[PDB]
Ligand binder design. Structure first.
Ligand SMILES: Cc1ncsc1CCOP(=O)(O)O
Ligand SMILES: C=C1C=NC(C)=NC1=N
Ligand SMILES: [Mg+2]
Length: 225
C-alpha cells in the first residue's frame, strides 16, 4: 500500500538489487510480456520509462502503464514511474524517478508524501544535493557505454560509486548504464546496492533467464562484499 513513513535504507537497498527499466520502444517483443518474464525471473524493482521516438502517448500510454503496474502487483514487486510526477500520483505508483533536467527533487518530495524517490546523479555535488532534497536512492552512471539513452553524461565506470562511499555517504545506490550479466560484479564490489538495466533484459532472447541470472549473481556479490 501507500507509505505513511519514509522507506528505510535497509529495505531500499534490498529493492535495488535487480532494477529492471523498460518502455515499449526498448524491445521487439510484446512489452507487457517482457515485463512479466523479467519479474518471473527475479527482478526486484521495475521502472516504467516511456519516452523518445515511437513511444506511446495519450491514453494508450496510460493503459500500458496500468498493465505494467498490474504485472508488478501479481509479482509482488514495486512499480516506479520515470519523469512523470502526475502519472505516478494518478496511478498510485510506489515511486518516482527523476533526473537533473527534470522537476526539482525538493519540489517532487513535497508532492509525493512518503513515496519512493530516486534521483539520477553524475557528480559528488549532485549526490549530496539529492540526499539533502529527500531522495531515497540515487542512480549513478553511465557506468559502461550505452546507446539505449543517447543524451547521456560521460562514462564514469565505478569511480563515483567509490568516491561516494569513501566520503562516508551511505545513501542507497544503484548503478546504471551498459550493465550486463558479465560486468555487474564490479558495480556491487565498488559499493553499490544493486544494478539497473534496460537492454540486457529487454532485448535478451530469454528475458526470464537473464533476470534469474542477475538475481543469482547479485545475491552472491552482496554477500561477498
Ligand atoms: C536510462 C539510462 N540512464 C542512464 S544510462 C541509461 C540507459 C540504460 O540502458 P542500458 O541498460 O540498455 O544501457
Ligand atoms: C537515468 C536513470 C538513472 N538511474 C535509474 C535507476 N533510472 C534512470 N532512469
Ligand atoms: Mg528523466
Amino acid at each position: 500500500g501507500i507509505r505513511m513513513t519514509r522507506i528505510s535504507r535497509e529495505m531500499m537497498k534490498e529493492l535495488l538489487s535487480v532494477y529492471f527499466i523498460m518502455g515499449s520502444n526498448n524491445t521487439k517483443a510484446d512489452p507487457v510480456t517482457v515485463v512479466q518474464k523479467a519479474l518471473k525471473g527475479g527482478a526486484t524493482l521495475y521502472q516504467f520509462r516511456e519516452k523518445g521516438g515511437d513511444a506511446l502517448t495519450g491514453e494508450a500510454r496510460i493503459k500500458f502503464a496500468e498493465k505494467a503496474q498490474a504485472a508488478c502487483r501479481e509479482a509482488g514487486v514495486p512499480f516506479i514511474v520515470n519523469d512523470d510526477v502526475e502519472l505516478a500520483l494518478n496511478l498510485k505508483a510506489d515511486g518516482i524517478h527523476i533526473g537533473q533536467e527534470d522537476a526539482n527533487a525538493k519540489e517532487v518530495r513535497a508532492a509525493i508524501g512518503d513515496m519512493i524517490l530516486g534521483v539520477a546523479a553524475h557528480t559528488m555535488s549532485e549526490v549530496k544535493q539529492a540526499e539533502e532534497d529527500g531522495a531515497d536512492y540515487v542512480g549513478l552512471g553511465p557506468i559502461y557505454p550505452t546507446e539505449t539513452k543517447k543524451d547521456t553524461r560521460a562514462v564514469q565506470g565505478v569511480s563515483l560509486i567509490e568516491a561516494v562511499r569513501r566520503q562516508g555517504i551511505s545513501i542507497p545506490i544503484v548503478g546504471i548504464g551498459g550493465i550486463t550479466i558479465d560486468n555487474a560484479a564490479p558495480v556491487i564490489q565498488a559499493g553499490a546496492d544493486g544494478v539497473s538495466m534496460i537492454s540486457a533484459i529487454s532485448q535478451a532472447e530469454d528475458p526470464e533467464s537473464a533476470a534469474r541470472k542477475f538475481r543469482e549473481e547479485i545475491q552472491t556479490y552482496k554477500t561477498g562484499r
